[PDB]
Paper text:
[name], possessing four amino acid substitutions of A114E, Q120K, V211S, and N346Y relative to [name]-2, confers high-level ceftazidime-avibactam resistance, and accumulation of the substitutions incrementally enhances the level of resistance to this agent. The other substituted residues E114 and K120 incrementally contribute to rejection of avibactam inhibition, while S211 stimulates the turnover rate of the oxyimino-cephalosporin hydrolysis.
We prepared the crystals of the [name]-ceftazidime complex by soaking a crystal of the [name] free-form in mother liquor containing 100 mM ceftazidime for 4 h. Crystal structure of the [name]-ceftazidime complex showed an acyl-enzyme intermediate where the S64 catalytic residue is covalently bound to the C8 atom of ceftazidime, and its β-lactam structure is cleaved. In contrast to the free form, crystal structure of the [name]-ceftazidime complex revealed a drastic structural change of the R2 loop in that the H-10 helix was disrupted and disordered at residues N285–L293. In comparing the crystal structures of the [name] free form and its complex, the C4 carboxyl group on the dihydrothiazine ring of ceftazidime occupied the position of the side chain of Y346 observed in the free form. The side chain of Y346 in the complex in turn was rotated 108° toward the H-10 helix and positioned to clash with the S287 residue, and this appeared to cause the disruption of the H-10 helix structure. We did not observe overall structural changes except for the R2 loop with the RMSD value of 0.68 Å, and the positions of the substituted residues E114, K120, and S211 were almost identical. The residues I284–L293 almost correspond to the disordered residues in the crystal structure of the [name]-ceftazidime complex, suggesting that, in the crystal, the fragile structure was entirely disrupted by the complex formation, without the influence of crystal packing. In the [name]-ceftazidime complex, the K120 residue formed a stable salt bridge with the D123 residue.
Residue numbers in the entry: 2 to 284, 291 to 361
Write the structure that this text describes.
């Protein structure tokens, strides 16, 4: 059983050389141990203006934004507004291209739609460009054949998922997920009064923030603090005291297993592997692989490693938890650094907290 000092000594002994080796300017880390968050901060949120990382510092979550997407989508399922078996064209009729018949919300939500591009092109800047973009996309595989990770599929899923509620994605995410969970420092658009807490990302030694883009809120655009992300991991790990019945089940649905791709199972936003597992088995994510459908989706199991990585131009994020142990970690950095380094550091910390 670890004391808070033993936790701090473990986390520092991993993060301190990591930040020097990767030249990370600032990091915020939360460990969930026995269900309780422990907070750690090092370095600068802004090097030139000498602003330290605090527990309020806002980091670009990058693709960890897709976990908020999944939970809001699972919430919509629980409300009865959508079903994953529903066709895409139900919620966007102007998608009359014959290639869209047979594509369901399930596919956009789990990257199995047949091969949408990784990013929405920079050319696309309004509804017309975006509708034209999807209308003229030619699939590479039949729906459900392969998993190909992308922003453009789960990004569209989140925008369509919220149409029954009659609410925008930002508004729905705020009303149905952020506010009920008390995530008061998690933003799609950082308010004026919070700009000063918005850390700068660093790429090649220069400060950068990500630029807006079509479907950015749904795929990569959430900013948040280490305290909120600790609460976000807490709630996804154990929603047993979430009061909203639909949000509680949405969290459960997001950790259901919808597809098997080797040793990994695709949730809604979240990804899972069986626990316990070797570090090397987490350490080709950008490759298209055959997807085996799990139908019905298998309910969540405690003995899993639930995680999501995210990156922007100037930030690297990683969150991971193992529900069987009430154990989890949030890793926020204002520099993008290699994915296997995050996994290895997360594993090293959580392996000593057994
Ligand atoms: C390789 C991908 C595919 S896109 C996806 C996504 C979510 O984090 N990232 C972006 O959309 C993104 N950059 O991705 C990389 C890291 C590939 C990049 O091009 O920098 C981005 C969004 S706004 C911004 N600035 N950058 N994640 C990753 C990852 O594994 O880090």
């Amino acid at each position: 059983m670890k004391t808070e000092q033993q936790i701090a000594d473990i986390v520092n002994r991993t993060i301190t050389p990591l930040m020097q080796e990767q030249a990370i300017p600032g990091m915020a880390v939360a460990v969930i141990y026995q269900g309780k968050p422990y907070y750690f901060t090092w370095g600068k949120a802004d090097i030139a203006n000498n602003h330290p990382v605090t527990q309020q510092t806002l980091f670009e979550l990058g693709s960890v934004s897709k976990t908020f997407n999944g939970v809001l989508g699972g919430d919509a399922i629980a409300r009865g507004e959508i079903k994953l078996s529903d066709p895409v064209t139900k919620y966007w009729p102007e998608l009359t291209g014959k290639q869209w018949q047979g594509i369901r919300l399930l596919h956009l939500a789990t990257y199995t739609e047949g091969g949408l591009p990784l990013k929405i092109p920079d050319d696309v800047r309004d509804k017309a460009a975006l509708l034209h973009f999807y209308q003229n996309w030619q699939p590479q595989w039949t729906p459900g054949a392969k998993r190909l990770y992308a922003n453009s599929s789960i990004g569209l899923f989140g925008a369509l998922a919220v149409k029954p509620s009659g609410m925008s994605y930002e508004e729905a995410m705020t009303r149905r997920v952020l506010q009920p969970l008390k995530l008061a420092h998690t933003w799609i658009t950082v308010p004026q009064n919070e700009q000063k807490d918005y850390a700068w990302g660093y790429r090649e030694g220069k400060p950068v923030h990500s630029s807006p883009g079509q479907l950015d809120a749904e795929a990569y655009g959430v900013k948040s603090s280490v305290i909120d992300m600790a609460r976000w991991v807490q709630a996804n790990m154990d929603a047993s005291h979430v009061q909203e019945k639909t949000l509680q089940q949405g969290i459960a649905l997001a950790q259901s297993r919808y597809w098997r791709i080797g040793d990994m199972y695709q949730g809604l936003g979240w990804e899972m592997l069986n626990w316990p597992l070797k570090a090397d088995s987490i350490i080709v994510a950008l490759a298209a692989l055959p997807a085996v459908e799990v139908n019905p989706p298998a309910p969540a199991v405690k003995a899993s490693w639930v995680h999501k990585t995210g990156s922007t131009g100037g930030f690297g994020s990683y969150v991971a938890f193992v529900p069987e142990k009430n154990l989890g970690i949030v890793m926020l950095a204002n520099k993008s650094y290699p994915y296997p380094v995050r996994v290895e550091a997360a594993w090293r910390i959580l392996e000593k907290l057994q």
